Design a protein around this ligand. Structure first.
Ligand SMILES: [K+]
Ligand SMILES: [K+]
Ligand SMILES: [K+]
Ligand SMILES: [K+]
Ligand SMILES: [K+]
Ligand SMILES: [K+]
Ligand SMILES: [Mg+2]
Ligand SMILES: [Mg+2]
Ligand SMILES: [Mg+2]
Ligand SMILES: [Mg+2]
Ligand SMILES: [Mg+2]
Ligand SMILES: [Mg+2]
Ligand SMILES: [Mg+2]
Ligand SMILES: [Mg+2]
Ligand SMILES: [Mg+2]
Ligand SMILES: [Mg+2]
Ligand SMILES: [Mg+2]
Ligand SMILES: [Mg+2]
Ligand SMILES: [Mg+2]
Ligand SMILES: [Mg+2]
Ligand SMILES: [Mg+2]
Ligand SMILES: [Mg+2]
Ligand SMILES: [Mg+2]
Ligand SMILES: [Zn+2]
Lengths: 122, 207, 9, 175, 37
RNA sequence: UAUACGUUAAGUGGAAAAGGAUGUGGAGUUGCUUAGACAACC
RNA sequence: UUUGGCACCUCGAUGUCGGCUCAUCGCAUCCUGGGGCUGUAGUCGGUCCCAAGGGUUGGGCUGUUCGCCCAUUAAAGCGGUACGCGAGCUGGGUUCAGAACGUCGUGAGACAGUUCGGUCCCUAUCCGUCGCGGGCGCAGGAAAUUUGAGAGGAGCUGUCCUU
RNA sequence: GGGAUAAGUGCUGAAAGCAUCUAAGCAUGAAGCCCCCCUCAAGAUGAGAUUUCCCAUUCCGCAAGGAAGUAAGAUCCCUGA
């Protein structure tokens, strides 16, 4: 459950360390985004020398959340943190590496490059 | 149209064959009995009157006993009509059983919503609170009653009052399982009302 | 209780 | 009305039955056509010559007079010769086809469009790209012809679509 | 359609007619279609 | 629910202007027309 | 709906900006539905007609209305209702007494100039609104099941795939 | 999904030999209108309908009315949700 002002760790090597959520995308009054949803966000903390710089507005896909996600079989997945991956408009990650486990839900939304790069998909 | 009366037992869940976990409501509907057929000639409209749930003799009265004589049945606790049914398909005294339905069939379920007693505008109409700080003395109140010009409040200014206890229909629920021996329908999802409350299960009107 | 009153200056 | 004053020749096999409220049934080789006319309009058949007599000279009657001749004139021509409007499909892959009673147009949509002609009207599909509505009632032939043209009416850039036979399309230029 | 208070012939092929109590112009040139309103 | 003769078809009557119009009633002037007009159709 | 003109109600008081809460109405329509014309190839548009059913975002700055900006959205409509709604809330501003700046004034002081601070009362009688009972009626007294005159509710819309 | 319509599109068609969606006649056509869907609803005094139950008591009265004890049935009171 990510909303305007939620800060997320960035689970990639794009240069951004922390982003602030500017907007949940996909409809007028949409309050909240979950795993596999895209957000507009500003980079609040960056790694020095990275591609993505502090202050850039960027799109990111959420790949883990504390709220987590329910599956049709009645099972759930939750993580210890909220994290996203900066993306281009075609869903490809701007970085080359993904850190930490991502949720299976990203396959469903056709974030395949992310799912392939992730060390674990739970 | 087809339909039956039962009691809401409660909720549980069932694994589907694909492994999906389906929440279900258990309705126990012992065989309903057709107590009366209303006809266009006599009554001005076609319907059957279903009785459900045998009542002790002490709890019956002579007018009730007489009304269920033609159907040759014990006095019934709940009596409802079904319109839209096939009149020729039913006879007075006929038992209507849960196996009229089958798994996968889409139904509408009707019952009385649980009672909540006297409730305010926040709970009853989903209104916003005023601020909780910044000097507010406006928390759970119902908002302006309206403009000055009419010198009166228009009808349908929503206010506190008794909430719940209303007839509610939920449309397009799926029968998950029919257990003919135990007289159970298992219906996907949740339906109006308290446990033990009378539920009417009908074939869906938008089918 | 107002500072000025109704239809203040 | 000049039109109302004009008499009309009835062929021998065109019976002209009358009834209450000047209701003229017209039998012939093709079929039967009934039409209730306006009460005041006067009508008479002598020596196989139907003539529409104008009762008054009010503009209301000046209108109904010419109309009543025209309709009877069409009712006669209907049962004798019959009417038919022609329709021409124009455009790549636009094709009509009869399918029992129904016309079936394939005119560039993602579904085929079907027209069921009512009792009396009949539709012929000589070419793949040509339709003909045949019938006795000139009104009712025109109606179905228009209903068919309405499916995909002639657009102005390349003239594509269902047109009437010998229809002038205002042809605009694209670029 | 031009909906305007002044319906007039724009060209020589324009016909002024009257339908359902409304003054209209009809023309081969569809730009010249006018209804009074 | 008068009488007589007219007008209106807009519920005009029962709120509005420049202006626009083959609405309809009454007058009147005038071009052309059985040496055949006007419309249609070589 | 503006700024005004007039000074007709109210000075033995008709609380006064903005916001909040709650709406409701108009249509001169912002979106969605239906169309005509196009200097409409297509995709987009422009312009006019019908249409008020429903819908019509969250932030930065400012007391602000407004506006500009960020990011969205199908869209981010315009207006009315005592500039809708303070016996419903707020009290930033405006609008008392303190103090100060610039300025004007010999001065006391003054300024829709600014600045920091500055008491928001009321147990609802009547109508009205939302709920809930009692009474009698409905040509006998009862227990159930009902018809529906009539009333309310709902009414939004995106994207992708396919063709 | 029906029904009827708005703008719009017409068909047939004269007034006005032609033309003309209109005057007679016949269509089509909107998230809109009336339905369809959900809820309340006979104090709808216009008080509706159906099924079933009780049964024509006693005493006052010239009757008109009145009183009493009851039937079917309900309630007081009580255990509660
Ligand atoms: K009037
Ligand atoms: K005053
Ligand atoms: K106050
Ligand atoms: K007041
Ligand atoms: K009062
Ligand atoms: K009643
Ligand atoms: Mg809120
Ligand atoms: Mg408080
Ligand atoms: Mg009043
Ligand atoms: Mg002009
Ligand atoms: Mg009027
Ligand atoms: Mg004066
Ligand atoms: Mg006073
Ligand atoms: Mg309008
Ligand atoms: Mg003002
Ligand atoms: Mg105000
Ligand atoms: Mg007030
Ligand atoms: Mg203040
Ligand atoms: Mg000085
Ligand atoms: Mg001042
Ligand atoms: Mg100054
Ligand atoms: Mg009704
Ligand atoms: Mg009754
Ligand atoms: Zn023209």
């Amino acid at each position: 459950m990510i909303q305007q002002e939620t800060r997320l760790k960035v689970a990639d090597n794009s240069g951004a360390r922390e982003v602030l959520t500017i907007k949940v995308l996909g409809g007028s009054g949409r309050k909240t985004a979950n795993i596999g949803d895209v957000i507009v966000c500003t980079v609040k903390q960056a790694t020095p020398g990275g591609v993505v710089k502090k202050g850039e507005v960027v799109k990111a896909v959420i790949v883990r959340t504390k709220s987590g996600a329910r599956r049709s079989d009645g099972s759930y997945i939750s993580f210890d943190e909220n994290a996203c991956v900066i993306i281009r408009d075609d869903k490809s990650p701007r970085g080359t590496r993904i850190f930490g486990p991502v949720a299976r839900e990203l396959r469903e939304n056709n974030f395949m490059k992310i799912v392939s790069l992730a060390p674990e998909v739970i | 149209t087809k339909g039956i009366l039962g009691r809401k037992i409660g909720m549980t869940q069932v694994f589907a064959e694909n492994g999906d976990l389906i929440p279900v409501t258990v309705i126990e509907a012992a065989p309903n009995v057709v107590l009366q057929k209303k006809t266009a000639e006599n009554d001005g409209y076609e319907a059957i009157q279903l009785g459900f749930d045998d009542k002790r003799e002490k709890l019956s009265n002579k007018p009730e006993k007489g009304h269920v004589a033609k159907a040759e049945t014990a006095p019934k606790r709940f009596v409802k009509e079904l319109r839209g049914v096939e009149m020729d398909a039913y006879e007075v005294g006929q038992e209507v059983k849960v196996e009229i339905f089958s798994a996968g069939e889409i139904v509408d379920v009707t019952g009385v919503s649980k009672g909540k007693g006297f409730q305010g505008a926040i709970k009853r109409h989903g209104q916003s609170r005023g601020p909780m700080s910044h000097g507010s003395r406006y928390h759970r109140r119902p908002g302006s009653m309206g403009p000055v010009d009419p010198n009166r409040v228009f009808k349908g200014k929503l206010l506190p009052g008794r909430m719940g206890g209303e007839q509610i229909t939920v449309q397009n629920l799926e029968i998950v399982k029919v257990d003919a021996e135990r007289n159970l329908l298992l219906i996907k999802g949740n339906v109006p009302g308290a446990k033990k409350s009378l539920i009417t299960v009908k074939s869906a009107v938008k089918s | 209780r107002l500072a000025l009153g109704d239809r203040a200056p | 009305s000049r039109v109302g004053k004009k008499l009309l020749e009835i062929p021998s096999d065109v019976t002209v039955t009358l009834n209450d409220n000047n209701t003229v049934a017209v039998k012939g080789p093709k079929g039967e056509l009934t039409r209730t006319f306006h009460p005041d309009m006067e009508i008479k058949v002598e020596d196989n010559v139907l003539t529409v007599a104008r009762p008054s000279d009010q503009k209301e009657h000046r209108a109904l007079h010419g109309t009543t001749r025209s309709l009877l004139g069409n009712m006669v021509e209907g049962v004798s010769k019959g009417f038919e409007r022609g329709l021409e499909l124009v455009g790549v892959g636009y094709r009509a086809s009869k399918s029992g009673n129904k016309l079936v147009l394939n005119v560039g949509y993602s579904h085929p469009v079907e027209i069921v002609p009512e009792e009396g009207i009949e539709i012929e599909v000589p070419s793949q790209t040509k339709v003909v509505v045949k019938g006795t009632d000139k009104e009712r032939v025109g109606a179905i012809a228009a209903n068919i043209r309405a499916v995909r009416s002639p657009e102005p850039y390349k003239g594509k679509g269902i047109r009437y036979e010998g229809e002038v399309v205002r042809r605009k230029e694209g670029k | 359609m031009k909906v305007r208070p002044s319906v007039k012939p724009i060209c020589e092929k324009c016909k002024v007619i009257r339908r359902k109590g409304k003054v209209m112009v009809i023309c081969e040139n569809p730009k010249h279609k006018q209804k009074q309103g």
